[PDB]
């Protein structure tokens, strides 16, 4: 209805969102194509418009994966974004803007992928989540909520805690990379101090839970830091 | 005087934040001016600007104020203020700001051009002025999201001094160590963490994980796995125990020890699987131990289960293919390998198995093409991945040996030898080439070299023993083959060599025993040893 009207329809950049969410959850093609077309254009606001639907798209992809448009969209955006992301590490021995007394790479370089495979898909998803974290301030509260709920659901899906959380649907353990959980923790940390305290709490707890089950040192480490830093 | 005057004006006006700003600036200038040649009004004037700025809901102005106060030249009085301020601003940077929103402290809304950079800077300055626990958490966050775990381990190591034996900092230090790649120290700190808290099974599980891995401290791993023994962590515990037992069995010296440890591993894996029938790790590793025990049908069943749980697990698919090859179903095995490869194109191990399977049912050309493919993949992808390249060339060499072309085999082995000249694999292949060319003494010496480098290389033992057998030195050949049997009793070629030796000596009963064992073993021999699949937590 409204979605179709949106399809048929700079000024453009400046209920529809909910309906689009419902389209993503329920198993679509023109929505994915229009979102990819949004990301293809230069204007950043459209990039942000697609970026809010990113977590729900990822969750849908993984959910379908447990038991062809969304994967195409994610992969397309992935190729669109991929570049080497490096930051300098400060030294106190050198005069700084704040006081008087080497480049390191955290992401890159990622290769272009025509197809999603079991190994590359989480490099892809982790990188996409990093891109999501890069523009976190411009993200609406609803998208942050979806992010938290989805991190939780992914973390506890095939595990006993799912039943405790009363998540209903597919109960299959989704294999997850460590870096993915780290990138989760970035967004969850952001969500904590932007009004979504409770959902970020559950998400954090579940990330710690899964990181303990998966025996992942780094997500457990960061999440432990976040939990300890909490007031 | 003027500073406290503007501050007082701000107070009486309680527009206000402006007076507080001016009061602050003049206060800093006044303090510096003093130092060249404590205030209540000065404190309120300095501080209550950014306070009302954040109360207003305006973040940009607050950040600006923080940066203004931090850019001021350090005075021996403003040091603590600058500490708390730097900490708070670092917090705000990490939790309330992203990359696309960040702007340089010099820029209008060393100078850090990025968010994490400035945050890190402020945290480091804070820790430095703190000399003589939140900042370290923030450091773990900032370095955690950026994967800088070594520097993190160093920072937390700098944090260990002030601290008593408390749980959080030590556990965090251990985890940072594990993430950084420092396995041993991590294991120690983890032992101390089990000392601090025996509630959490994650800690001994992590220790066991490290011990089972590169360190190869199997005894310690057994200890931790025992220490672990909720249903999930008990499952994980028996799983780790089984992995340890299996690895120990591989390392075991005698057949008795080997069989005992393999049975124990089997029991622990069965228990782990019955604790959690959804954990595909336990199911898979159970199936793997069963494969190792040459119980192919059972192994197939539990592989089918493990795959029903996780259909795209590379190890599960690979084990399926190896089990199929064990039943001499080479084409089906190859199909399944090709499937896993359609899911895992970069996987070298899968590709090696593809090479062997193609040599078994498709022919030499195909397997050589798979070798060239592996070579291309290796070039595109690029410690020791050099061993992988050497193995590519050596596999090509095995293909050429299989055909009967000593020249090309010599070439491929020569590439491998350019990489590792005294690899026991290379030496063995030089022996194979010598046998192919007919020079048996040269072959003998090459296998001797190989066993000099790797005294347990069963293939070299087989070949050397065979050569000695053809020379007439039966006792020596037999002794060698007995050692070989101890190294790997499932090696049917060893039992055939042994049966031939015993038969030559006139010991017919024992010889036929050997031959029978060889037949039963070759009945369930996979194209690639099941142990090629790593046993890791």
XYZ file of C-alpha atoms in Angstrom:
768
model
C 0.000 0.000 0.000
C 2.085 2.881 1.346
C 5.220 0.968 0.335
C 4.008 0.725 -3.267
C 3.293 4.462 -3.275
C 6.846 5.038 -2.039
C 8.164 2.852 -4.865
C 6.199 4.722 -7.531
C 7.138 8.109 -6.049
C 17.738 16.414 -2.878
C 14.245 17.545 -1.845
C 13.462 13.840 -1.593
C 16.371 13.396 0.824
C 14.907 16.106 3.057
C 4.399 4.986 8.789
C 6.466 4.187 5.696
C 9.396 3.012 7.815
C 7.199 0.698 9.902
C 5.564 -0.793 6.803
C 9.012 -1.327 5.286
C 10.092 -3.097 8.481
C 7.033 -5.349 8.188
C 7.994 -6.053 4.571
C 11.477 -7.067 5.729
C 10.222 -9.343 8.530
C 7.595 -11.106 6.401
C 8.916 -13.242 3.513
C 10.331 -7.680 -0.804
C 12.373 -7.555 -4.020
C 11.436 -4.017 -5.083
C 12.136 -2.796 -1.546
C 15.622 -4.328 -1.622
C 16.297 -2.962 -5.106
C 15.181 0.547 -4.129
C 17.330 0.429 -0.982
C 20.361 -0.707 -2.990
C 19.556 2.051 -5.475
C 19.512 4.459 -2.530
C 22.951 3.296 -1.401
C 24.212 3.533 -4.985
C 23.512 7.289 -5.135
C 25.853 9.885 -3.635
C 23.514 11.598 -1.152
C 24.266 10.504 2.414
C 20.704 10.783 3.745
C 19.591 7.893 1.546
C 22.601 5.930 2.783
C 21.325 6.583 6.296
C 17.784 5.668 5.253
C 18.931 2.222 4.131
C 21.320 1.900 7.066
C 18.447 1.883 9.575
C 17.005 -1.247 7.957
C 20.427 -2.945 7.918
C 20.126 -4.854 11.219
C 16.657 -6.234 10.451
C 17.900 -7.251 7.008
C 20.846 -9.081 8.566
C 18.587 -10.849 11.066
C 16.213 -11.883 8.289
C 19.130 -13.164 6.216
C 20.499 -15.271 9.069
C 17.010 -16.499 10.008
C 16.263 -17.685 6.465
C 19.794 -19.105 6.403
C 19.068 -21.255 9.467
C 16.077 -23.041 7.905
C 17.755 -14.298 -2.602
C 17.057 -10.565 -2.478
C 18.334 -9.593 0.974
C 21.682 -11.332 0.427
C 21.992 -9.519 -2.905
C 21.297 -6.183 -1.201
C 23.754 -6.797 1.642
C 26.441 -7.953 -0.781
C 25.807 -4.996 -3.084
C 26.114 -2.500 -0.237
C 29.207 -4.389 0.925
C 30.883 -3.983 -2.475
C 29.727 -0.362 -2.553
C 31.481 0.374 0.759
C 34.721 -1.558 0.235
C 39.616 1.179 1.243
C 41.741 0.620 4.347
C 40.632 1.947 7.736
C 43.595 2.953 9.890
C 44.110 5.191 12.924
C 47.260 6.551 14.576
C 48.059 5.576 18.171
C 48.954 8.594 20.353
C 52.220 8.859 22.278
C 52.764 11.008 25.366
C 56.409 11.505 24.366
C 55.242 13.868 21.619
C 53.636 17.277 22.334
C 49.879 17.130 21.820
C 46.889 19.415 21.415
C 46.019 18.687 25.062
C 49.366 18.265 26.836
C 53.138 18.710 26.951
C 55.567 15.857 27.758
C 52.557 4.765 13.934
C 49.601 3.849 11.716
C 47.653 0.708 12.627
C 44.966 -1.069 10.588
C 41.789 -2.264 12.300
C 39.784 -3.011 9.146
C 41.098 -3.619 5.634
C 41.586 -4.381 2.906
C 38.395 -6.272 2.014
C 38.076 -7.955 -1.413
C 35.156 -7.732 -3.851
C 32.789 -10.700 -3.591
C 30.296 -11.805 -6.247
C 28.794 -14.489 -4.010
C 28.122 -15.098 -0.303
C 29.905 -18.139 1.118
C 30.173 -19.544 4.635
C 33.668 -18.109 5.262
C 33.367 -14.642 3.651
C 29.801 -13.863 4.766
C 30.890 -12.890 8.286
C 33.779 -10.763 7.062
C 31.059 -9.062 5.039
C 28.532 -8.792 7.862
C 31.146 -7.642 10.384
C 32.284 -4.933 7.968
C 28.686 -3.858 7.293
C 28.065 -3.637 11.039
C 31.215 -1.508 11.279
C 29.770 0.814 8.638
C 26.596 0.880 10.727
C 28.593 1.831 13.826
C 30.355 4.568 11.865
C 27.058 6.435 11.408
C 25.508 5.601 14.796
C 24.555 9.168 15.812
C 22.287 9.639 12.789
C 20.470 6.396 13.644
C 16.864 6.606 14.946
C 15.895 5.069 18.304
C 13.806 2.376 16.607
C 16.808 1.164 14.605
C 18.881 0.994 17.786
C 16.102 -1.003 19.447
C 15.989 -3.409 16.509
C 19.779 -3.662 16.727
C 19.646 -4.622 20.408
C 16.801 -7.124 19.993
C 18.557 -8.673 17.004
C 21.942 -8.958 18.734
C 20.113 -10.700 21.574
C 18.158 -13.068 19.295
C 21.267 -13.956 17.292
C 23.319 -14.562 20.429
C 20.810 -16.850 22.152
C 18.916 -18.403 19.209
C 19.662 -22.126 19.358
C 20.514 -22.033 23.044
C 18.374 -22.699 26.170
C 18.278 -18.991 27.038
C 16.135 -18.381 23.934
C 13.217 -20.075 25.680
C 13.845 -17.906 28.746
C 13.764 -14.789 26.555
C 10.606 -16.277 25.033
C 11.871 -15.608 21.519
C 9.676 -17.685 19.241
C 10.351 -18.912 15.737
C 13.445 -20.728 14.545
C 15.524 -22.325 17.307
C 18.772 -23.033 15.453
C 22.236 -22.041 16.675
C 23.549 -19.339 14.348
C 27.350 -19.573 13.953
C 28.852 -16.153 14.696
C 32.352 -14.712 14.292
C 34.096 -12.962 17.183
C 34.605 -9.645 15.391
C 30.896 -9.650 14.658
C 30.141 -9.757 18.376
C 32.629 -6.940 18.928
C 30.872 -4.783 16.327
C 27.658 -5.720 18.108
C 29.119 -4.404 21.353
C 29.920 -1.065 19.711
C 26.268 -0.466 18.801
C 25.048 -1.854 22.128
C 27.405 0.488 23.990
C 26.004 3.361 21.943
C 22.437 2.215 22.662
C 23.168 2.126 26.399
C 23.685 5.879 26.637
C 21.012 6.897 24.121
C 17.826 5.946 25.947
C 17.728 2.221 25.255
C 19.137 1.127 28.611
C 17.026 -2.007 29.118
C 17.363 -3.491 25.628
C 21.082 -2.736 25.680
C 21.211 -4.493 29.050
C 19.623 -7.669 27.676
C 21.731 -7.496 24.516
C 24.913 -7.053 26.563
C 24.012 -9.972 28.821
C 23.317 -12.206 25.829
C 26.553 -11.188 24.116
C 28.448 -12.109 27.288
C 26.456 -15.364 27.437
C 27.298 -16.405 23.880
C 30.893 -15.190 24.173
C 31.227 -17.479 27.177
C 29.683 -20.405 25.305
C 31.709 -19.695 22.137
C 34.883 -19.167 24.209
C 35.569 -15.845 22.492
C 38.147 -13.748 24.393
C 37.626 -10.337 22.769
C 33.818 -9.918 22.895
C 33.865 -11.219 26.449
C 36.617 -8.709 27.212
C 34.894 -5.652 25.700
C 31.470 -6.558 27.077
C 33.036 -7.142 30.509
C 34.545 -3.674 30.248
C 31.172 -2.188 29.265
C 29.366 -3.925 32.112
C 31.999 -2.829 34.623
C 31.908 0.767 33.329
C 28.122 0.942 33.749
C 26.740 3.158 36.558
C 39.836 39.501 40.388
C 38.180 39.867 36.982
C 37.592 36.115 36.699
C 35.799 35.902 40.042
C 33.947 39.067 39.023
C 32.517 37.527 35.849
C 31.816 34.366 37.840
C 29.974 36.412 40.469
C 27.999 38.126 37.707
C 27.071 34.684 36.406
C 25.940 33.735 39.908
C 23.799 36.847 40.389
C 22.293 36.347 36.931
C 21.162 32.915 38.130
C 23.718 34.207 29.400
C 25.030 32.496 32.540
C 27.198 29.951 30.731
C 28.870 32.871 28.946
C 29.907 34.468 32.244
C 31.115 31.075 33.462
C 33.117 30.685 30.241
C 34.811 34.072 30.563
C 35.445 33.456 34.265
C 37.048 30.131 33.382
C 39.311 31.544 30.674
C 40.485 34.429 32.840
C 40.951 31.958 35.712
C 43.275 29.782 33.632
C 45.198 32.827 32.402
C 45.458 33.955 36.037
C 46.760 30.594 37.240
C 49.378 30.408 34.490
C 50.333 34.021 35.224
C 50.777 33.030 38.871
C 52.993 30.080 37.963
C 55.213 32.344 35.853
C 55.892 34.847 38.641
C 41.806 27.170 46.738
C 39.234 29.368 45.000
C 35.565 28.532 45.496
C 34.530 31.255 43.052
C 37.325 29.995 40.807
C 36.060 26.403 40.990
C 32.446 27.321 40.226
C 33.557 29.686 37.466
C 35.828 27.111 35.841
C 33.490 24.144 36.090
C 29.838 25.232 35.986
C 30.030 26.247 32.312
C 30.090 22.829 30.641
C 27.798 21.593 33.417
C 24.983 23.917 32.343
C 25.977 23.212 28.741
C 25.238 19.502 29.144
C 22.203 20.235 31.323
C 20.974 22.315 28.384
C 21.146 19.199 26.223
C 23.804 20.730 23.995
C 26.716 18.322 23.522
C 28.781 20.332 21.028
C 29.280 23.296 23.364
C 30.287 20.966 26.191
C 32.844 19.164 24.044
C 34.123 22.564 22.950
C 34.520 23.673 26.563
C 36.334 20.464 27.515
C 38.704 20.940 24.578
C 39.247 24.587 25.537
C 40.227 23.684 29.096
C 42.398 20.810 27.875
C 44.246 22.899 25.277
C 45.375 25.249 28.048
C 49.011 24.823 29.089
C 49.323 22.543 32.124
C 49.472 24.222 35.531
C 50.310 22.287 38.721
C 46.835 23.178 40.025
C 44.758 22.471 36.911
C 46.228 18.965 36.604
C 43.477 17.144 38.524
C 40.741 19.148 36.825
C 42.325 18.296 33.471
C 42.388 14.645 34.562
C 38.692 14.348 35.426
C 37.825 16.454 32.377
C 39.934 14.334 30.011
C 38.350 11.176 31.415
C 34.797 12.496 31.032
C 35.423 13.817 27.519
C 36.964 10.482 26.537
C 33.821 8.784 27.852
C 31.605 11.120 25.824
C 33.778 10.476 22.756
C 33.538 6.686 23.012
C 29.876 6.303 24.001
C 28.143 9.371 22.564
C 29.985 10.029 19.307
C 30.703 8.089 16.113
C 33.095 8.502 13.178
C 30.921 10.527 10.804
C 30.069 13.046 13.534
C 33.614 13.623 14.799
C 35.547 16.827 14.119
C 39.054 17.978 15.068
C 39.406 19.969 18.325
C 41.036 22.646 16.153
C 38.272 22.362 13.558
C 35.020 24.313 13.852
C 31.901 22.153 14.395
C 49.395 16.208 17.724
C 45.754 16.825 16.819
C 43.716 13.583 16.644
C 41.804 13.474 13.348
C 39.651 10.578 14.559
C 37.351 9.805 17.489
C 39.110 6.747 18.904
C 42.397 8.651 18.588
C 41.371 11.573 20.802
C 39.627 9.218 23.223
C 42.802 7.128 23.528
C 44.876 10.277 24.033
C 42.665 11.575 26.841
C 42.638 8.144 28.492
C 46.435 7.892 28.392
C 46.885 11.397 29.807
C 44.362 10.532 32.525
C 46.232 7.351 33.459
C 49.535 9.238 33.505
C 48.285 11.972 35.825
C 46.644 9.208 37.868
C 50.109 7.803 38.580
C 51.217 8.604 42.152
C 39.884 1.790 37.430
C 37.382 3.307 35.001
C 40.034 4.628 32.620
C 41.371 1.105 32.110
C 37.878 -0.153 31.292
C 37.589 2.631 28.733
C 40.990 1.620 27.350
C 39.802 -1.982 27.022
C 36.771 -0.651 25.147
C 38.643 1.674 22.770
C 41.393 -0.841 22.001
C 38.865 -3.670 22.012
C 36.733 -2.280 19.196
C 39.934 -1.656 17.236
C 41.538 -5.036 17.894
C 44.640 -3.587 19.548
C 44.911 -6.255 22.233
C 48.698 -6.254 22.673
C 48.860 -2.587 23.654
C 45.820 -3.335 25.790
C 47.689 -6.138 27.543
C 50.521 -3.690 28.193
C 48.118 -1.091 29.636
C 46.353 -3.594 31.879
C 49.824 -4.803 32.881
C 50.543 -1.227 33.942
C 47.273 -1.457 35.886
C 48.236 -4.629 37.792
C 50.620 -2.804 40.133
C 48.143 -0.701 42.129
C 45.584 -3.493 42.309
C 45.172 -6.150 44.974
C 44.116 -9.632 43.899
C 40.716 -8.517 42.601
C 38.767 -10.417 39.948
C 37.853 -7.917 37.229
C 41.253 -6.425 36.375
C 43.026 -9.795 36.442
C 40.379 -11.521 34.315
C 40.411 -8.593 31.897
C 44.205 -8.796 31.746
C 43.996 -12.537 31.057
C 41.449 -12.062 28.271
C 43.498 -9.251 26.734
C 46.522 -11.557 26.856
C 44.583 -14.329 25.122
C 43.350 -11.942 22.439
C 46.868 -10.566 21.948
C 48.240 -14.039 21.240
C 50.322 -14.431 24.393
C 49.038 -17.907 25.262
C 51.311 -18.956 28.148
C 51.000 -15.795 30.266
C 47.264 -15.894 29.608
C 47.172 -19.460 30.932
C 49.007 -18.433 34.114
C 46.782 -15.419 34.783
C 43.801 -17.696 34.095
C 45.016 -20.178 36.722
C 45.117 -17.242 39.106
C 41.609 -16.343 37.903
C 40.330 -19.808 38.796
C 42.025 -19.164 42.129
C 40.084 -15.912 42.531
C 36.740 -17.305 41.338
C 35.801 -21.007 40.979
C 32.206 -20.189 39.990
C 32.876 -19.461 36.326
C 33.634 -22.458 34.100
C 34.505 -20.138 31.228
C 37.926 -19.531 32.776
C 39.118 -23.147 33.021
C 37.490 -23.765 29.637
C 39.531 -20.918 28.133
C 42.706 -22.183 29.785
C 41.994 -25.671 28.418
C 41.393 -24.119 25.002
C 44.805 -22.446 25.052
C 46.547 -25.580 26.348
C 44.976 -27.780 23.656
C 46.014 -25.350 20.938
C 49.462 -24.125 19.938
C 51.044 -24.595 23.376
C 50.162 -28.296 23.249
C 50.159 -28.675 27.029
C 47.887 -31.719 26.959
C 48.378 -32.584 30.633
C 47.397 -29.079 31.747
C 44.458 -29.212 29.334
C 43.323 -32.447 30.967
C 43.591 -30.771 34.369
C 41.494 -27.744 33.338
C 38.906 -29.889 31.556
C 38.650 -31.950 34.744
C 38.278 -28.737 36.762
C 35.261 -27.834 34.631
C 33.658 -31.197 35.441
C 24.693 -25.799 33.875
C 24.322 -28.562 31.285
C 25.897 -26.495 28.497
C 29.205 -25.897 30.266
C 29.290 -29.504 31.462
C 28.820 -30.539 27.839
C 31.620 -28.171 26.854
C 33.718 -29.599 29.691
C 33.377 -33.220 28.618
C 33.956 -32.033 25.044
C 37.261 -30.415 25.990
C 38.138 -33.504 28.018
C 37.504 -35.724 25.001
C 39.573 -33.475 22.760
C 42.426 -33.617 25.262
C 42.187 -37.413 25.519
C 42.176 -37.727 21.726
C 45.211 -35.474 21.276
C 46.996 -37.421 24.012
C 46.151 -40.665 22.201
C 47.719 -39.262 19.052
C 50.743 -38.366 21.189
C 50.655 -41.694 23.081
C 53.699 -43.948 22.752
C 52.334 -47.495 23.090
C 49.311 -49.263 21.592
C 47.888 -49.903 25.060
C 48.022 -46.222 25.977
C 46.651 -45.282 22.556
C 43.651 -47.599 22.833
C 42.924 -46.581 26.433
C 43.060 -42.859 25.642
C 40.972 -43.297 22.482
C 38.303 -45.173 24.435
C 38.345 -42.474 27.129
C 38.012 -39.786 24.458
C 35.103 -41.738 23.005
C 33.383 -41.882 26.401
C 33.885 -38.167 27.082
C 32.536 -37.308 23.629
C 29.496 -39.540 24.091
C 28.808 -37.898 27.457
C 29.264 -34.444 25.937
C 26.822 -35.310 23.153
C 24.233 -36.711 25.572
C 24.579 -33.543 27.663
C 23.790 -31.378 24.641
C 22.387 -33.084 21.504
C 22.182 -29.646 19.854
C 25.885 -28.818 20.207
C 27.282 -29.872 16.839
C 30.844 -29.650 18.146
C 30.267 -32.629 20.440
C 28.423 -34.608 17.762
C 31.099 -33.905 15.182
C 34.038 -34.742 17.439
C 32.288 -37.907 18.548
C 31.943 -38.862 14.887
C 35.609 -37.978 14.372
C 36.803 -40.225 17.190
C 34.606 -42.978 15.778
C 36.239 -42.365 12.394
C 39.668 -42.626 14.027
C 38.622 -45.944 15.583
C 37.686 -47.108 12.066
C 34.033 -47.379 13.067
C 32.831 -45.946 9.764
C 29.054 -46.586 9.903
C 28.606 -45.133 13.413
C 30.829 -42.204 12.462
C 28.651 -41.680 9.390
C 25.529 -41.584 11.547
C 26.916 -39.015 13.968
C 28.278 -36.973 11.055
C 24.775 -36.962 9.582
C 23.492 -35.706 12.928
C 26.205 -33.035 13.198
C 25.315 -31.903 9.671
C 21.600 -31.833 10.419
C 22.552 -29.429 13.205
C 24.974 -27.358 11.109
C 24.652 -28.068 7.392
C 27.488 -25.805 6.271
C 30.194 -26.790 8.755
C 33.401 -27.247 6.745
C 34.819 -29.866 9.114
C 31.554 -31.840 9.115
C 31.362 -31.914 5.314
C 35.033 -32.832 5.107
C 34.617 -35.682 7.599
C 31.614 -36.867 5.616
C 33.748 -36.978 2.474
C 36.563 -38.821 4.253
C 34.128 -41.380 5.654
C 32.738 -41.883 2.161
C 36.264 -42.383 0.831
C 36.781 -44.883 3.654
C 33.928 -46.907 2.175
C 35.647 -46.593 -1.214
C 32.923 -44.188 -2.374
C 35.442 -41.865 -4.023
C 33.089 -40.118 -6.451
C 30.487 -39.311 -3.775
C 33.281 -38.144 -1.490
C 34.619 -35.919 -4.261
C 31.148 -34.475 -4.889
C 30.820 -33.573 -1.226
C 34.295 -32.020 -1.178
C 33.302 -29.956 -4.218
C 30.197 -28.897 -2.279
C 32.181 -27.765 0.763
C 34.498 -25.944 -1.649
C 31.524 -24.183 -3.216
C 30.984 -23.013 0.353
C 34.707 -22.728 1.178
C 36.738 -21.784 -1.924
C 39.828 -20.620 -0.018
C 40.118 -23.747 2.145
C 43.455 -25.406 1.332
C 42.788 -28.610 3.290
C 39.561 -29.309 1.403
C 41.520 -28.688 -1.799
C 44.214 -31.196 -0.802
C 41.530 -33.800 -0.149
C 40.055 -32.936 -3.549
C 43.479 -33.586 -5.056
C 43.769 -37.016 -3.424
C 40.212 -38.002 -4.359
C 40.753 -36.913 -7.959
C 43.930 -38.989 -8.058
C 41.795 -41.895 -6.827
C 38.811 -41.719 -9.190
C 39.233 -38.945 -11.781
C 42.841 -39.178 -12.942
C 46.155 -37.267 -12.830
C 45.297 -34.349 -15.142
C 42.348 -33.243 -13.013
C 44.324 -33.387 -9.769
C 47.187 -31.466 -11.373
C 44.681 -28.791 -12.416
C 43.447 -28.677 -8.820
C 47.086 -28.209 -7.788
C 47.497 -25.307 -10.216
C 44.261 -23.891 -8.829
C 45.673 -24.148 -5.302
C 48.794 -22.396 -6.564
C 46.750 -19.505 -7.965
C 44.770 -19.248 -4.733
C 48.004 -19.234 -2.744
C 49.432 -16.453 -4.917
C 46.268 -14.390 -4.455
C 46.233 -14.915 -0.673
C 49.922 -14.017 -0.360
C 54.768 -17.505 9.798
C 54.116 -20.556 7.619
C 51.756 -20.446 4.667
C 54.990 -21.533 2.993
C 54.406 -25.029 4.337
C 51.114 -24.953 2.451
C 52.829 -23.992 -0.817
C 55.442 -26.686 -0.243
C 52.596 -29.145 0.265
C 50.997 -28.019 -3.001
C 54.195 -28.757 -4.872
C 54.691 -32.026 -2.993
C 51.134 -33.098 -3.856
C 51.812 -32.385 -7.518
C 54.980 -34.428 -7.053
C 52.971 -37.319 -5.566
C 50.750 -37.213 -8.643
C 53.760 -37.361 -10.956
C 55.244 -40.216 -8.891
C 51.936 -42.049 -9.126
C 52.014 -41.776 -12.906
C 55.702 -42.600 -13.316
C 57.374 -39.316 -14.234
C 60.506 -38.803 -12.094
C 61.462 -35.569 -13.891
C 58.322 -33.539 -13.135
C 58.146 -35.048 -9.650
C 61.747 -33.927 -9.162
C 60.777 -30.444 -10.345
C 57.825 -30.101 -7.965
C 59.767 -31.550 -5.042
C 62.516 -29.096 -6.007
C 60.134 -26.172 -5.547
C 59.194 -27.632 -2.171
C 62.915 -28.013 -1.430
C 63.576 -24.408 -2.376
C 61.152 -23.684 0.429
C 62.171 -26.430 2.895
C 65.313 -28.315 1.749
C 65.399 -30.685 4.743
C 61.683 -31.264 5.232
C 61.158 -34.950 5.993
C 58.370 -34.802 3.424
C 60.800 -33.475 0.823
C 63.403 -36.106 1.764
C 60.747 -38.827 1.612
C 59.742 -37.610 -1.845
C 63.383 -37.726 -2.929
C 63.347 -41.328 -1.780
C 60.191 -41.994 -3.796
C 61.812 -40.433 -6.842
C 64.901 -42.587 -6.311
C 62.763 -45.745 -6.152
C 60.999 -44.648 -9.323
C 64.364 -44.157 -11.040
C 65.601 -47.504 -9.738
C 68.420 -46.273 -7.506
C 67.583 -48.194 -4.340
C 70.617 -47.290 -2.241
C 70.005 -43.598 -2.887
C 66.360 -44.145 -1.917
C 67.410 -45.895 1.280
C 69.670 -42.984 2.197
C 66.935 -40.418 1.485
C 64.495 -42.221 3.758
C 67.257 -42.438 6.356
C 67.644 -38.656 6.105
C 63.888 -38.221 6.466
C 63.829 -40.397 9.597
C 66.844 -38.503 10.885
C 64.737 -35.359 10.692
C 61.420 -37.011 11.621
C 61.967 -40.345 13.478
C 58.245 -41.189 13.381
C 57.530 -40.722 9.679
C 55.639 -43.961 9.083
C 55.903 -43.734 5.281
C 59.695 -43.438 5.425
C 59.730 -46.366 7.840
C 57.655 -48.492 5.435
C 59.870 -47.714 2.474
C 63.167 -48.120 4.319
C 61.982 -51.403 5.835
C 60.923 -52.639 2.410
C 64.327 -51.780 0.954
C 66.071 -53.587 3.811
C 63.718 -56.540 3.267
C 64.731 -56.748 -0.384
C 68.361 -56.504 0.752
C 67.909 -59.514 3.032
C 68.322 -57.766 6.384
C 65.065 -59.077 7.850
C 65.657 -58.466 11.565
C 66.419 -54.769 11.097
C 63.440 -54.344 8.775
C 61.221 -56.045 11.346
C 62.468 -53.829 14.181
C 61.824 -50.726 12.101
C 58.326 -51.962 11.234
C 57.625 -52.665 14.924
C 58.509 -49.068 15.716
C 56.246 -48.057 12.829
C 53.411 -50.173 14.237
C 53.855 -48.321 17.504
C 53.644 -44.958 15.719
C 50.527 -45.877 13.731
C 48.914 -49.303 14.017
C 46.176 -48.488 11.489
C 48.743 -48.336 8.681
C 47.976 -51.373 6.527
C 51.106 -50.891 4.401
C 53.136 -51.402 7.562
C 51.308 -54.650 8.330
C 51.873 -55.846 4.769
C 55.582 -55.065 4.979
C 55.705 -56.833 8.336
C 53.847 -59.871 7.038
C 56.273 -60.067 4.140
C 59.243 -59.891 6.520
C 57.834 -62.568 8.834
C 56.931 -64.715 5.835
C 60.482 -64.360 4.523
C 61.880 -65.384 7.908
C 59.698 -68.492 7.885
C 57.167 -67.263 10.428
C 54.032 -68.021 8.421
C 51.373 -67.800 11.143
C 52.413 -64.321 12.294
C 52.792 -63.314 8.647
C 49.212 -64.288 7.792
C 48.088 -62.498 10.955
C 49.783 -59.363 9.624
C 48.265 -59.786 6.158
C 44.772 -60.186 7.630
C 45.161 -57.070 9.745
C 46.315 -55.235 6.615
C 43.205 -56.355 4.700
C 40.786 -55.361 7.462
C 42.527 -52.004 7.828
C 42.633 -51.202 4.107
C 38.929 -52.064 4.063
C 38.231 -48.860 6.021
C 41.083 -46.590 4.927
C 40.093 -43.005 4.044
C 41.753 -41.125 1.174
C 43.111 -38.715 3.788
C 43.817 -39.339 7.512
C 40.859 -38.187 9.640
C 43.314 -36.387 11.926
C 43.821 -33.780 9.185
C 40.772 -32.149 10.731
C 42.030 -30.094 13.695
C 40.814 -30.968 17.183
C 40.285 -27.580 18.820
C 37.859 -26.019 21.295
